[PDB]
Amino acid sequence: ARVHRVTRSFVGNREIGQITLKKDQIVVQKGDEAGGYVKVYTGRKVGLFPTDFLEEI
């Protein structure tokens, strides 16, 4: 499992599949990055999030 900490809060555009996450939230990567985004799982929801705002733990 690739597990990441959110480094900066980000409001996602849900119309295009992005997710809102808060700084310091922990998420699990699902699949590979593309175009600056990656799919992540919060434990309740899945969506796309900017890879620049993730740090692997």
Nearest residue to 47 via CA among 29, 22, 25, 34? 29
Of all helices (H) and strands (E), which one includes residue 4?
strand 3-6
Q: Are 41 and 49 in contact (CB under 8 A)?
A: no
What span, in angstroms and rounded, lies between the C-alpha atoms of 40 and 10?
A: 13
Q: Which DSSP state fits 44?
A: S
> Max CA-CA distance within the chain?
29
Q: Are 5 and 42 in contact (CB under 8 A)?
A: no
What span, in angstroms and rounded, lies between the C-alpha atoms of 24 and 14?
A: 21
What span, in angstroms and rounded, lies between the C-alpha atoms of 48 and 26?
A: 14
